[PDB]
Design a protein around this ligand. Structure first.
Ligand code: HOV
Length: 180
């Protein structure tokens, strides 16, 4: 169906594998040379993008107005390739979303789409004891290797996967104002 194809097109055109010293993560290319990754990926001066050593020109760890981490890190990459602009799919406000999917690349044998079900704007949680804001929660047993996975519905790019406890999974919310 179109929602599955939209997800496969996000993988094909707007995803990459980001390797840092903390492991491999699914990276979302937002536009131009800007890619997002979970903050806990801890990208250094150089990362790998699909195995290619790439200098990071600038890195921006995003925080809310109270100085709480959003678990979104924006990276400007020193590479020739430009990502298709997907900002128009990113919502302007916090909300709930029924029947969402996660598009996974890193740590998978091939591009994978997981149907995670209904998503709710969940507020702040503690991820390994650290307060993290603007969480999107789903009742799906997400696992190790899923981080950076892209939360989406047809025509909507909603978040990036950051954590879970074996029952629930959590994404850092993507808001359009972060990138405009
Ligand atoms: C993704 C990390 C990844 O793929 O790295 C590749 C090298 C995982 C996903 C997680 C693992 C188990 N199920 C999942 O969905 N993320 C983590 O392991 C995160 C990570 C972290 C993220 C942000 C800030 C600090 C640390 C390390 C801890 N973590 C977790 O998900 C923990 N869960 C919680 O703390 C938690 C809190 C709540 C309300 O639910 N879960 C796990 C205990 C490891």
């Amino acid at each position: 169906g179109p929602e599955e194809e939209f997800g496969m097109s996000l993988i094909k055109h707007n995803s990459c594998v980001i390797t840092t010293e903390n492991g491999k993560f699914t990276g979302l290319g937002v536009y131009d040379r800007f890619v997002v990754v979970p903050t806990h990926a801890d990208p250094g001066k150089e990362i790998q993008v699909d195995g290619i050593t790439t200098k990071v020109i600038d890195s921006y760890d995003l925080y809310n107005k109270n100085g709480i981490k959003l678990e979104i890190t924006v990276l400007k990459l020193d590479r020739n390739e430009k990502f298709r602009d997907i900002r128009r799919y990113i919502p302007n406000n916090e909300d709930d979303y029924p029947n969402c999917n996660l598009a996974l690349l890193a740590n998978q044998p091939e591009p994978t789409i997981i149907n995670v079900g209904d998503v709710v704007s969940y507020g702040n949680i503690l991820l390994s004891g650290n307060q993290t804001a603007r969480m999107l929660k789903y009742s799906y047993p997400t696992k190790s290797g899923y981080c950076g996975g892209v939360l989406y519905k047809i025509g909507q790019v909603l978040g990036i996967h950051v954590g879970g406890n074996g029952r629930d999974g959590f994404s850092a919310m993507l808001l359009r104002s972060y990138f405009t």
